[PDB]
């Protein structure tokens, strides 16, 4: 009688069954458990949880004095009037929903500064699994918060009002600087609802004005209604007339960045971004998301300063450093630069000896001149439009849109009031393509730093005359203090560190794999330890004492993915959380990740910034997260209960041959 | 930002959307619907629905008073003691569960013969879109039910006391009847524990003894406790130590088969059929399975009698035309013949011409001899063995077991007391490889049957001989009025049948599509109405309005699909069905088929019986259907809301061409 094989009943049996935790946690009872290597217990539950909740309460007091701070005055920004909430309706509903970000007829939004902080789980694993010393300062240095008003306005200010250098960029610099595969550009001749339906963003992200929702609620919305609308108002060339009758239809929102930030500067630092409609982002993104998929990266083409886009595992780790001792004497042969957003690498050589250089921008957003924005836009837009002719007119229209919001935009702040850049230098942060404007104006004044090498100007390898440079020749800020050029190990040993310098949040490591060097991304464990005490989550409500313990388990595999596992005391620490971990959690069926678990927080690992889980009750071991970054992959990821999907299916392992002799 | 294309949310959102049946009904308002082809509606919902509920009642009065006839003795059965219930523990709990099959230690159980019939819920929507006195002679002939305790004792003494004929087989003629792939038989030479979970078989099915449980939840207990202690027994020769300590882990038990049965025999045929244990039964099923997979059929091997695993989709229906044209003079050359379980097709030439014969037997499982029950089990395990010698003891041991359980396997019936089976000979259905050891049977006589017609014995060819013959020389008893061949359309026309006769349970048929003909199955409107009005299920009270609606829409699909949609009534009540079916429901998210909808019950469209639709809310057309027996690329199902995709999240899509030039 056929119908369903015995294998697939016991599968379907184990989905069943790890759907419930009462009798998950029976079922491996006496489950053989494979324990990752973990630090030393410390001290009790109880006296973890005191002390790490005695931090919490401190660093809300400190949160609260800050965020009590009188704040500038924004006079330095152009105010327009006051916007009407959007009218247009999507048959029954309006787009702008009834009772939210409304003022009496007007479009409004509220700040928000909470006093809330962190959930204090992960900072209790620490204070149990190390030295309390050691985790009560880490723990008191940073935090994650909403930020003040006074750092949110110094900020806002900083970035808006700042004296801008215009470059000198042509497209055959940019051809030259960022080269690209034609090929692999999107086909923009096809039909509009196609394309766009096929740019990727984050569904819970806010869709902006006048949806007010999330990207997921109002994309039906936007697709069917608005995108149309603008569509033929573009068109038609008759964008003023839609801009004059739905001034909300092109608003942005102005927000203060909820992130970790240093607890003695919340007072004078909250970094601001900008939110714009859901319909203007999507559509440039057809065109931003199109170029990053074609462009060369540094490793690809060794004339490219692109690093956007570049990842560290798949021996991407190994190619940074294959490419960056191609690097000639300073004078006599070009350097090796790469640039990925604010963030750049540099490798000279000074008598043959290879240097590396990590400096630091002081919110470069604000340096980025509107000759610079402009010419990238163009030299994107021309890239499709020189492969698809057919639709040149409409995307050089887009261009203009997508120029405007890059720096001219309307938003809101706080309030009902509407803003505007007096000038239209500097990068409204938060806009489509602001890794690659960054990116463009960060290479173009570095590839002008080389250019001064060659005339023999070697003392703009010091720091004093690098940031005076940057400054007068291109207004770029390079941060005092970062600008250290360190002797670089070219061959390094295994457990030897390429530099203590950082790329992209990561230093470079070199270990052991199997009579083989790989090549590692790596933190010191104080740099770990502040990013586990301090998750990028405030307390939910609703999230039950059983998903908060997963929680730690999941945050404990992305950390010892992205590199904490080369590291001891991270690596015990990591192992202590998930060998501390209950059975019944290890198992359980999740729905992050597809259900294999939620990802890595890095989103270096892969260019395509998909990391997924093999299996969702496995444990990152050494060799399982080395072969993730060595050429060859040849390892399955460890499960913690060895011969579990059979104990959650209510049988187990038994060997029965047929060849026995009777 | 990116986490996922926009075009995923969307698909996210559709996926929700067709979970929420009124939100779903509201989104699907004012849609286009594509209707298909129906009847017009005959009478009102009202008057519909009373003549369904009184022609129940009446079926429901007739199974009651047939089941209260008195039944004969089991005096013809051997007379066993009472068997222990099986204390084996698995853990927290024991394999033979607490208070349930027992009766004071011993093993017992209850036979169910309930007077529960059918829903009514199809034979309304008969009454809705048909005429009434024949929706009502209809389906006062057949009824899905439980049966009687005369019936059913009837025709298990008749199965079991039966006078067999040894046939003279060896294990060339099987080679020459039955011809395999050695190279499609699955390996068991490696592991045991991997080749059972290699079988298939039916969650809902009772494991049997000492387990009493569906196999889904007896599966734990049957692999990690029951099968490794089995083993053990095996690899030791000790089996009559394990029988005689746990008699239960070889009982089995005799169970009345609930199914369609005729009226006015309802206190004389009630099939019954054994249910082996958990253990056995897939433990043998290594060596069924695998050998069936590998086995050659009438259309790829003409020297084949072998049915057993023919398909009609996919150019079945027309591959069978093909085969059966080869079929020579009778007495000159060789004629065609098809065995399928005990179902076998006949063709012939007298004179030139092709003449077709579909005779049945009576309850052959009755006649099935030792000798080629034997002959079978020992021709399976020697291709395995022939393949893989590495293995051979211990499979041949298992062939032991396996003839076993086809004929002197104890069984209870219904109490306490324990059967046998009094002679070796006939078949005790139920047991695994049912099916191969009628099709055996029934080529080891047509074959002799073949022989004799090269004989000169062409009257052989009368039924008046072939009844005596086949009851004579084999002791099988064909049905008298069976044997009746008919002038075989070797090229019909479209819209013309190969013959009136049926194979598998259906008749061979040509169609037309565009230019070219079709071979297609199907039947009279009153047989796909009397499947229609009679579902193989009984009322479920925890079963819904709208289930029972979703489900009309199935059988709806899957009638459609067997050949229902080549008969124009039949067609008609289906596209009734169908369209008289809500949009909430018909674009509903479904479970059964993996999501796609639930398979039509006909377990002969595809060779491994499973057929999946291609979508859960689409319909069987005329064309869809048709590409499906063809052997060339079947079209896309017709959805029925063409524009549901598109409604359900919300959307309507917009061309906006980027091509276009600016003011
Ligand atoms: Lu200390
Ligand atoms: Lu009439």
Redesign the interface.
Known sequence: ??????????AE?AMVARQDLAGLKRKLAGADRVLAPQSPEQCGRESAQAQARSVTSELKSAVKEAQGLEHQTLDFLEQLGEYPVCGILHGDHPVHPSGTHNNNGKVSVKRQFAAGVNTSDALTCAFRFEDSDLVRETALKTTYTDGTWAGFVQRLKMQTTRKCVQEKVSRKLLKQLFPYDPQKLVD??????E???????????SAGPPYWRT??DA??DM??CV??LL?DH?????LTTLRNKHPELFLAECKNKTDRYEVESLGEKTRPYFSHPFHLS?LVSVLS?SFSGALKIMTEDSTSFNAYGFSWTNGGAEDLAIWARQAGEAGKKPPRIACYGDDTDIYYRKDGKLYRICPDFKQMDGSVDATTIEAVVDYVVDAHVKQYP??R???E?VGKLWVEMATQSPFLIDGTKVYRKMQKDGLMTGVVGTTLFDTVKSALAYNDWADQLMFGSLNLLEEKYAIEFFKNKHGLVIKEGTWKPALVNEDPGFGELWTEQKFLGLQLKVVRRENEKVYVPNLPFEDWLTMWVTPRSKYRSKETETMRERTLFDRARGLLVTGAVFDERARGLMGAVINSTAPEVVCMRVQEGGGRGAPPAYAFLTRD?VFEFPISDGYPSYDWVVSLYSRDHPCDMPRVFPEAATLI??????????????
């Not at 009688?1 to 016991?10: C, D, G, H, N, V």
């Not at 923009?188 to 609802?193: A, C, F, T």
């Open positions: 009688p056929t119908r369903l094989s015995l294998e697939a009943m016991l049996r923009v001749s096809g039909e509009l609802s394309l766009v339906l096929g740019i990727k963003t984050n569904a819970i992200a990207k997921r994309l039906p697709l069917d995108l149309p569509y573009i068109v038609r060339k008759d999507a998301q057919t639709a007119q409409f995307w229209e910034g299916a209510s049988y187990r392992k038994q060997v029965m041959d047929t060849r026995v002799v009777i």
